[PDB]
């Protein structure tokens, strides 16, 4: 997160860190046994870390649970990042409490102009590199489809939306991928891609979660 703020410990209780020896992506807990993340975050050997603030210090609210199964979206295209979504099942159910909690799925697609909360442990610099230890937060609006497409000609599909600031300075970044965009208490987005971070006229591009609720629900019901 570039240009955001320090969330505070466990203020984002659905935020997970995906760990393969080191943090490499975010994710969102959607029930006691399932996490949603970005397909481009896929790898084997994932451990899900819940209850994290400082990802380098055991502070007392963590749950570390290995993944039993990963499901990349059937139509994920890594070349175009279309359908950049994946589900991860936990080997055991997380213990849910106020600091570890699931985020509701949308019942409809949110609108341009809605303010959302984006969070992650990604890079905090736009021309440089500094990875934080504690969770960073950004409040940012969904941008119109037309300004999104104008910013990224030939690249924005019906499964993507832009959020952030065309003036630059405030954005998600490398290492935030897979994490949440939450608007009015619903998971509307997954951190997916962008050109650099926090650059003028290059806002963040997010997986449009509302398109995937039927796939998420039926996948969870049968796995
Ligand atoms: Ca920790």
UniProtKB/Swiss-Prot annotation:
Cofactor(s), by name: Ca(2+)
Active site: 40 (charge relay system), 84 (charge relay system), 177 (charge relay system)
Entry's Gene Ontology BP terms: digestion; proteolysis
Record bears the keyword Hydrolase: yes
Positions bound to substrate: 171-172, 174-175, 177
Reactions that this protein is recorded to catalyse: Preferential cleavage: Arg-|-Xaa, Lys-|-Xaa
Regions crossing the membrane: none
EC number: 3.4.21.4
Keywords annotated in UniProt: Calcium, Digestion, Disulfide bond, Hydrolase, Metal-binding, Protease, Secreted, Serine protease, Signal, Zymogen
One GO cellular component, as annotated: serine protease inhibitor complex
Peptidase S1 domain sequence ranges: 1-221
Cofactor: record remark: Binds 1 Ca(2+) ion per subunit.
Tissue: Synthesized in the acinar cells of the pancreas.
Post-translational modification: Subsequent cleavage after Lys-125 leads to alpha-trypsin. Further cleavage after Lys-170 yields pseudotrypsin. A cleavage may also occur after Arg-99. Not sulfated on tyrosine residue(s).
UniProt protein name: Serine protease 1
Species this protein is from: Bos taurus
């Amino acid at each position: 997160i570039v240009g955001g703020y320090t969330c505070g410990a466990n203020t984002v209780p659905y935020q997970v860190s995906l760990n393969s020896g080191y943090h490499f992506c975010g994710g969102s807990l959607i029930n006691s046994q399932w996490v949603v993340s970005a397909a481009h975050c896929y790898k084997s050997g994932i451990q899900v870390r819940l209850g994290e603030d400082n990802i380098n210090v055991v502070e007392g609210n963590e749950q570390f649970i290995s993944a039993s199964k990963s499901i990349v979206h059937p139509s994920y295209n890594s070349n175009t990042l279309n359908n950049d979504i994946m589900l991860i099942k936990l080997k055991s159910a997380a213990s849910l409490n106020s600091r570890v909690a699931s985020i509701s799925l949308p019942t409809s697609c949110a609108s341009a102009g809605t303010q959302c909360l984006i969070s992650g442990w990604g890079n905090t610099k736009s021309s440089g590199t500094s990875y934080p230890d504690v969770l960073k937060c950004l409040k940012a609006p969904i941008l119109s489809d037309s300004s999104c497409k104008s910013a990224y000609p030939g690249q924005i599909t019906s499964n993507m939306f832009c959020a952030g600031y065309l003036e630059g300075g405030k954005d998600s970044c490398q290492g935030d991928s897979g994490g949440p965009v939450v608007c009015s208490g619903k998971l509307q987005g997954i951190v997916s891609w962008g050109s650099g971070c926090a650059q003028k006229n290059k806002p963040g591009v997010y997986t449009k979660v509302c398109n995937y609720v039927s796939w998420i629900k039926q996948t969870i019901a049968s796995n």
